[PDB]
Amino acid sequence: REHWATRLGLILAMAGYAVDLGNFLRFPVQAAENGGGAFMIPYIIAFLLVGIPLMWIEWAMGRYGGAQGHGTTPAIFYLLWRNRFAKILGVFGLWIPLVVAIYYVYIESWTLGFAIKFLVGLVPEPPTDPDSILRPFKEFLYSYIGVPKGDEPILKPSLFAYIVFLITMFINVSILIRGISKGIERFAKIAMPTLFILAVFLVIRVFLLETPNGTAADGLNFLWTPDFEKLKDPGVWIAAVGQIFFSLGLGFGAIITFASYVRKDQDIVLSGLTAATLNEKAEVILGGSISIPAAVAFFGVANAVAIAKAGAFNLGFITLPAIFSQTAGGTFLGFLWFFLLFFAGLTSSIAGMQPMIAFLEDELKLSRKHAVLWTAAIVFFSAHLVMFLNKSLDEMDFWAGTIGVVFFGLTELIIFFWIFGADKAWEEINRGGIIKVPRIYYYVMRYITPAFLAVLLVVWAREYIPKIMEETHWTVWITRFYIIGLFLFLTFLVFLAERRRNHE
Numbered sequence: 001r002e003h004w005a006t007r008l009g010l011i012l013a014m015a016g017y018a019v020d021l022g023n024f025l026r027f028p029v030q031a032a033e034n035g036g037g038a039f040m041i042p043y044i045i046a047f048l049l050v051g052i053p054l055m056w057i058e059w060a061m062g063r064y065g066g067a068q069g070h071g072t073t074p075a076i077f078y079l080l081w082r083n084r085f086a087k088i089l090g091v092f093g094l095w096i097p098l099v100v101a102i103y104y105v106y107i108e109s110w111t112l113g114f115a116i117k118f119l120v121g122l123v124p125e126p127p128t129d130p131d132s133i134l135r136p137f138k139e140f141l142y143s144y145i146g147v148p149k150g151d152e153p154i155l156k157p158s159l160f161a162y163i164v165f166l167i168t169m170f171i172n173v174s175i176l177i178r179g180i181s182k183g184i185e186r187f188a189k190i191a192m193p194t195l196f197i198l199a200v201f202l203v204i205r206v207f208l209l210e211t212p213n214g215t216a217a218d219g220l221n222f223l224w225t226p227d228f229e230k231l232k233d234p235g236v237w238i239a240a241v242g243q244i245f246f247s248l249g250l251g252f253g254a255i256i257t258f259a260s261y262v263r264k265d266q267d268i269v270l271s272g273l274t275a276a277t278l279n280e281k282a283e284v285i286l287g288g289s290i291s292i293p294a295a296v297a298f299f300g301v302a303n304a305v306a307i308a309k310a311g312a313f314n315l316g317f318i319t320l321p322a323i324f325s326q327t328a329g330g331t332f333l334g335f336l337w338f339f340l341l342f343f344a345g346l347t348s349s350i351a352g353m354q355p356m357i358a359f360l361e362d363e364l365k366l367s368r369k370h371a372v373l374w375t376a377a378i379v380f381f382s383a384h385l386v387m388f389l390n391k392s393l394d395e396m397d398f399w400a401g402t403i404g405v406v407f408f409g410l411t412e413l414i415i416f417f418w419i420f421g422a423d424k425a426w427e428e429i430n431r432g433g434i435i436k437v438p439r440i441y442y443y444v445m446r447y448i449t450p451a452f453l454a455v456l457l458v459v460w461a462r463e464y465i466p467k468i469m470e471e472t473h474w475t476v477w478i479t480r481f482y483i484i485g486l487f488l489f490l491t492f493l494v495f496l497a498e499r500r501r502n503h504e
């Protein structure tokens with residue numbers, strides 16, 4: 001079995017997975033909407049009671065499986081729980097990242113496309129008033145994606161958007177096909193320092209921004225001024241637990257698979273904690289210092305609330321580009337912003353497609369070359385649904401990217417700490433540890449962490465599922481049909497894997 005060559009590469013690869021577009025866009029918006037500086041109280045608590053415990057568990061499960069030559073959850077769950085239902089539940093841990101890949105790599109391709117257009121100056125140039133500046137960029141984005149102008153749920157992406165998607169798939173393949181140490185690990189040691197340099201440059205440049213409407217200082221103010229009255233709202237604690245869960249990328253299978261290339265007795269306690277820490281720093285320090293402070297500096301604190309409510313996507317793909325076209329040398333600034341997002345996405349997508357690569361390698365005994373090419377083939381083909389069918393992206397993001405992962409996160413906890421055995425699980429986590437997990441976490445992992453996730457899942461199921469089922473367009477069944485099919489297809493692959501094993 002392949003192994004991470006160095007401790008540094010392992011940590012940077014894991015952190016690279018966690019550090020994504022959300023760090024620079026989602027987190028700052030969530031913080032502004034849920035109490036500003038006060039948001040850090042439930043955020044740190046969620047980190048302590050949910051994020052860190054689960055992450056250690058996923059590392060442990062992965063390393064445990066890797067020791068027996070298995071990197072994915074259908075086989076790993078079966079090792080922890082010799083039951084047929086464990087294998088089927090394990091399929092979900094292969095389905096979720098596959099479905100996410102089918103839309104996320106496409107979104108990743110947008111950032112590359114925008115970076116190129118900015119670099120060569122193929123961007124709009126307004127003109128006055130905010131709407132006079134934003135609209136040309138809203139249209140620019142919509143023409144890139146091909147947002148429906150009529151009543152049909154049909155997208156019509158530009159030729160450029162389609163070709164950039166191909167190139168983005170090629171870049172992902174180039175890394176993955178070289179493997180863990182020579183591919184993913186090698187790239188992490190280049191990409192993370194590059195990510196850090198781009199962000200710091202952006203932070204510095206943003207802190208120098210001054211407009212008649214305000215300054216960057218105003219932005220940092222609005223974002224970090226605490227509003228403790230929002231702490232009463234249970235949804236703010238839900239938002240924190242949710243933010244933490246997604247920011248660490250728990251429940252996606254990627255962490256377990258990466259850990260399966262960690263040697264049997266190599267530390268995971270300190271390494272895992274370190275990776276999580278980098279993500280948190282990149283999140284609150286770098287992410288919180290760029291997008292929102294820039295927006296408030298240009299439009300004024302008067303529009304701070306409106307900007308925050310417009311969402312993470314509008315902020316990163318419409319608002320900031322518009323601002324950059326109004327600032328000195330902003331065109332090169334725009335390139336750097338989208339270059340930053342692209343590497344943040346790329347380090348996440350190579351991690352997210354590895355579980356499917358690992359499964360074909362470990363369980364169906366495919367060569368790395370074949371496993372990478374077939375995985376890319378499926379993601380590329382399937383993505384045409386996301387490229388041409390409106391709201392298909394959203395449907396996939398909901399079932400797999402939202403409900404699925406929280407459900408799967410809870411499933412990991414229960415199977416590991418309750419079915420497999422908390423004592424066996426506890427020793428599995430701490431073995432080879434540079435530091436030992438605090439004794440208190442035994443109770444957290446067993447009762448607190450699953451309680452939190454159960455609450456999150458129930459609240460989100462009751463809130464969003466009735467809406468999605470009753471108020472959506474009929475074309476959502478096309479996407480539902482397709483991803484249910486993918487789950488059946490994977491169940492079949494798992495079936496062939498156990499049949500092959502019975503023969504040999």
Ligand SMILES: CNCC[C@H](Oc1cccc2ccccc12)c1cccs1
Pocket residue numbers: 017018019020096097098100101102104105246247248249250252254348349350351352353401
């Ligand atoms: C915390 N960072 C990981 C982000 C995660 O990334 C992935 C998680 C799981 C599978 C993936 C497959 C391809 C690309 C990215 C993948 C997500 C992406 C979109 C929504 S959540």
Ligand SMILES: CCCCCCCCO[C@@H]1O[C@H](CO)[C@@H](O)[C@H](O)[C@H]1O
Pocket residue numbers: 146155156157158159160161162
């Ligand atoms: C069966 C063959 C169909 C190939 C599907 C890929 C077609 C390439 O689709 C491209 O993407 C966009 C379509 O919205 C626009 O870029 C272009 O007009 C088209 O070239």
Ligand SMILES: CCCCCCCCO[C@@H]1O[C@H](CO)[C@@H](O)[C@H](O)[C@H]1O
Pocket residue numbers: 468469470471472473474476477478
């Ligand atoms: C092959 C595609 C056929 C699917 C059409 C079945 C009818 C779908 O019907 C629609 O389903 C939506 C999504 O659940 C609901 O939001 C709508 O209210 C409902 O009218």
Ligand SMILES: CCCCCCCCO[C@@H]1O[C@H](CO)[C@@H](O)[C@H](O)[C@H]1O
Pocket residue numbers: 470477478481
């Ligand atoms: C690709 C095949 C898709 C299968 C279609 C699913 C049928 C959904 O049947 C249901 O009809 C209900 C009547 O109220 C509607 O509210 C919704 O359309 C749907 O949930």
Ligand code: NA
Pocket residue numbers: 018019020022023246247248249279283
């Ligand atoms: Na993150």
Ligand code: NA
Pocket residue numbers: 015016017018019020343344345346347348349
């Ligand atoms: Na990343």
